Amino acid sequence: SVSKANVPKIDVSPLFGDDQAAKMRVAQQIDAASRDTGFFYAVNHGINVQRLSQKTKEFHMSITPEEKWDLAIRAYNKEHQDQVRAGYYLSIPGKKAVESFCYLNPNFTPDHPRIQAKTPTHEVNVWPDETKHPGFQDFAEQYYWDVFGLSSALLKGYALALGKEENFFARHFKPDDTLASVVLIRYPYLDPYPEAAIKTAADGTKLSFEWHEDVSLITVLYQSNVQNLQVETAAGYQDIEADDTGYLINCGSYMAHLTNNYYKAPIHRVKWVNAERQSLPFFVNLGYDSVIDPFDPREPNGKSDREPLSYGDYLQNGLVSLINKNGQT
Numbered sequence: 001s002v003s004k005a006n007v008p009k010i011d012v013s014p015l016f017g018d019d020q021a022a023k024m025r026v027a028q029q030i031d032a033a034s035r036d037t038g039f040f041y042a043v044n045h046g047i048n049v050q051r052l053s054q055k056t057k058e059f060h061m062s063i064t065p066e067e068k069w070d071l072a073i074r075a076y077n078k079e080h081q082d083q084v085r086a087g088y089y090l091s092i093p094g095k096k097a098v099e100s101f102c103y104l105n106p107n108f109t110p111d112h113p114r115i116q117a118k119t120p121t122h123e124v125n126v127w128p129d130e131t132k133h134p135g136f137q138d139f140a141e142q143y144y145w146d147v148f149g150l151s152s153a154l155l156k157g158y159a160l161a162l163g164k165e166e167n168f169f170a171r172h173f174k175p176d177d178t179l180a181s182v183v184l185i186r187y188p189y190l191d192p193y194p195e196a197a198i199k200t201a202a203d204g205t206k207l208s209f210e211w212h213e214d215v216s217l218i219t220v221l222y223q224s225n226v227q228n229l230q231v232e233t234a235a236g237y238q239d240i241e242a243d244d245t246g247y248l249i250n251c252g253s254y255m256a257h258l259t260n261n262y263y264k265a266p267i268h269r270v271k272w273v274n275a276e277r278q279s280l281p282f283f284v285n286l287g288y289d290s291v292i293d294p295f296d297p298r299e300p301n302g303k304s305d306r307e308p309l310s311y312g313d314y315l316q317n318g319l320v321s322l323i324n325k326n327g328q329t
């Protein structure tokens, strides 16, 4: 007997346009959801999301164990020391069910100043062989720019929601330096299902991934129509219903930092469900040196005691802590 969570569907199309009052009315809906369960679905987002699903299914289902070693992150392949973030995250049959492929900003090439200077969190994407996966790199790169465009529009809504000018976050979310990532997650069907891949909550619920706050400004998530997400509320954990036509949005712990917990980063987790499904998050992260002053929209004056925190240190530390709390993925 678990409840459904209030996860309103908000038409974000006005954030792409120039009707200011219409943008305010969207911002009011984002303010309301951000202060309630902390989730909403963005609809009328303009992304070709059936193609995203199909191309991702194609990749996941045609990639071979050989390819996966050749693309693997440092945790699965020691030869691959630079890859802490970007690459393949392998399955372990009998033990670990999930697997995935993470990629970063496509403008991180050997000549980008940030990979010349070896700045942490910045990596050059690895890719499969073009003729084994025809069109995949081109598809994936363009998806990165499509969701970047969406996320950019959402962030104008968050800014307006908070009483700011609309470019308040978005001006620091730039194609040249953003540390945003796409992750293409596969959660497979299996029996026998490997028991070491299931965790049990304090309430008995079986899980594929335990409670956590996201490491992001916001998170912009496509998922297949299989129900799996729960958010923690004052009244206990609630089910987030699936909607494969929409993007599930929520704040991460950096928005909570920037707003003195006014927009909280909702605590959530993933139920274990034995079904073939996709989780494709885009983590909206700012540039390495972005350091917005924390504010407080509770206060007549808007002043916060919190100290600024540069996005790169935030992210490097947060990613590492997520792995320590909830395991290597």
Ligand SMILES: C[C@@H](NC(=O)[C@H](CS)NC(=O)CCC[C@H](N)C(=O)O)C(=O)O
Pocket: 084, 085, 086, 102, 180, 181, 183, 185, 209, 212, 213, 214, 215, 221, 270, 279, 280, 281, 283, 319, 322, 329
């Ligand atoms: C939405 C999706 N998220 C996840 O699996 C979890 C929790 S938000 N996220 C992560 O592991 C963080 C990956 C960061 C990525 N490698 C990067 O370098 O940026 C899910 O749980 O299905």
Ligand SMILES: [Fe+2]
Pocket: 212, 213, 214, 268
């Ligand atoms: Fe999450």
